[PDB]
Paper text:
FolD is a dual function enzyme: it catalyses a reversible NADP+-dependent dehydrogenation step (5,10-methylenetetrahydrofolate (5,10-CH2-THF) dehydrogenase (DH)) and a subsequent cyclohydrolysis step (5,10-methenyltetrahydrofolate (5,10-CH=THF) cyclohydrolase (CYH)).
After lysine methylation, this protein crystallized in the same space group as the wt protein and crystals diffracted to 1.9 Å. The overall structure of ecFolDMethQ98H is not altered when compared to wt as a result of the mutation (Cα rmsd 0.11 Å) and the effect of the Q98H mutation was unexpected. The presence of H98 allows the side-chain of Y50 to rotate 90° compared to the apo wt ecFolD structure. The result is a fully ordered helix α2 with good density for all residues, which we believe reflects a stabilization of the protein. The absence of the hydrophobic interaction between carolacton and Y50 leads to significantly weakened binding, which we believe to be reflected by the much faster association and dissociation of carolacton in SPR experiments with ecFolDQ98H. The binding of carolacton to ecFolD Q98H was seriously attenuated as reflected by the SPR data. The mutants G8S and Q98H could still be inhibited by carolacton, but with much higher IC50 compared to the wt.
Residue numbers in the entry:
A (entry chain B): 1 to 285
B (entry chain A): 2 to 286
Write the structure that this text describes.
């Protein structure tokens, strides 16, 4: 077999070009560019990689970006006050708070202080619950980017038997609610599942989000399945590989996302899309 | 022959536990929990609703407060009442009866209720918190079903659980309760291909379609736990579930009768939710 590639690098470029074109049209009409704000408490190389990636995502489409770097000693009360200020700032469309926050700060209270209309990551419980109850607003980026992939490849979802491997808050759980919204029969597997293969073997649409290199072998995959690999696993040797053994799954799948170049770029593209949506639909209509 | 999941008896146990906790609060000099019910307009449906909640409160020694507003009530006046009740420290739960007059935005009113007073559990914040494995107040019917399984000492971790129906009121939140309980969780619905295959593999089957005899009994896996949420009134006055009982009960290890199964757990769980709001969120010791 020769599965077709789900070329997320190319689809993400299309999404960024569409956003950039809408930003240019707003500018031409005398309207402000969307703005993204990133908040960090303390610093380290990883968090500065986080900031820089959000910065360059903004510059590729013409958003304004702002970064707050607060000292490690910042108190919960000071941080909630900053969130309040950003919630009230009409030039800010999206707020991101980088996690790990220092020991002693209630992470959940800070994140839930963000107004759901500026929660462009889509993780505020209000936004997750809206998605669950079929009235989505801002949606978690990785599942929404996967739905975009399926739509852009003209994959009919109604009636597919879809299996999600992994029940994380960031991917697996909201993925199940996106797939239900798209009319798939949905199964979520996780660490307590008896026999992963029996569920995987019947999946027309397989979403793998376990964070383990080469965990899913080609032999488990249903012939003709659509295989979406969310893993981005860094190996000793600098290479990045998926949660699925690509060479063996590609023998059986009809479509497959490579890693790198599949789901990865779509997650960032969906953050950007969400920020434009917040600006256009919720703030400056 | 299947053992019966006697929801009438379990519901009475839960109500009695709530009542005895209220007794202990009174003995300690603490206030009874309070429920407020808001109706706009009056028809037999709304009056049955209020009577039912007042009854449930009286049974367990709660305070209940009923507001009956005329159909002339504006949206602004209703939201101001919700604001007043959100701020009232003697009120632990707020219920707003639907339908509301055509000129009122139902969603804006229901989402104005503070989530820690949303004892029905359907505020998106509460649904999202359950999705994110950090439940607060939870939808009553799915939470009552989890209670039934606990009281019969049914181990849910690892079960292959199949929900039939993806409604907002039952199927979707049921799936997130089941994931929280460690089940491998499949949600089927009107677009599911070959339902029988899913049913034949289910260790735990929750049926919530509202169609009499939709699932034939011989589809049930030998040894399954069968939870029937249907309450279907037939021509001849009989009340029947979504699963054909006689045939299912020859195969299941456990089965809920209809009536007297899931039905009584819904109101019992509302009362339990109201006590939880009081004891945990409003007047903790």
């Amino acid at each position: 077999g020769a599965a077709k590639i789900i070329d997320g690098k190319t689809i993400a470029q299309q999404v960024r070009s569409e956003v950039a074109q809408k930003v240019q049209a707003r500018i031409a009409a005398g309207l402000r560019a969307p703005g993204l704000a990133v908040v960090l408490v303390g610093s380290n190389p990883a968090s500065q990689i986080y900031v820089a990636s959000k910065r360059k995502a903004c510059e590729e489409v013409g958003f304004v970006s702002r970064s707050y770097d607060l000292p490690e000693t910042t108190s919960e009360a000071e941080l909630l006050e900053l969130i309040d200020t950003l919630n009230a700032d009409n030039t800010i469309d999206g707020i991101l708070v980088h996690l790990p926050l220092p020991a002693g700060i209630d992470n959940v209270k800070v994140l839930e202080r963000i107004h759901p209309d500026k929660d462009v990551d889509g993780f505020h419980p209000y936004n997750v619950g809206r998605l669950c109850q079929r009235a989505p607003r801002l949606r978690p980026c990785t599942p929404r980017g996967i739905v975009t992939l399926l739509e852009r490849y003209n994959i009919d979802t109604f009636g597919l038997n879809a299996v999600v491997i992994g029940a994380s808050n960031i991917v697996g759980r909201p993925m199940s609610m996106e797939l239900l919204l798209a009319g798939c029969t949905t199964t979520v597997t996780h660490r307590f599942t008896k026999n992963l293969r029996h569920h995987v073997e019947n999946a027309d649409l397989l979403i793998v989000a376990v964070g383990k290199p080469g965990f899913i072998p080609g032999d488990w995959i249903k012939e003709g399945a659509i295989v979406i690999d969310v893993g981005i696993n860094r190996l000793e040797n600098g290479k990045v590989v998926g949660d699925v053994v690509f060479e063996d799954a590609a023998k059986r799948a009809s479509y497959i996302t490579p890693v790198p170049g599949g789901v990865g770029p779509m997650t960032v593209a969906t953050l950007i899309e969400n920020t434009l949506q917040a600006c256009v639909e919720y703030h400056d209509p």
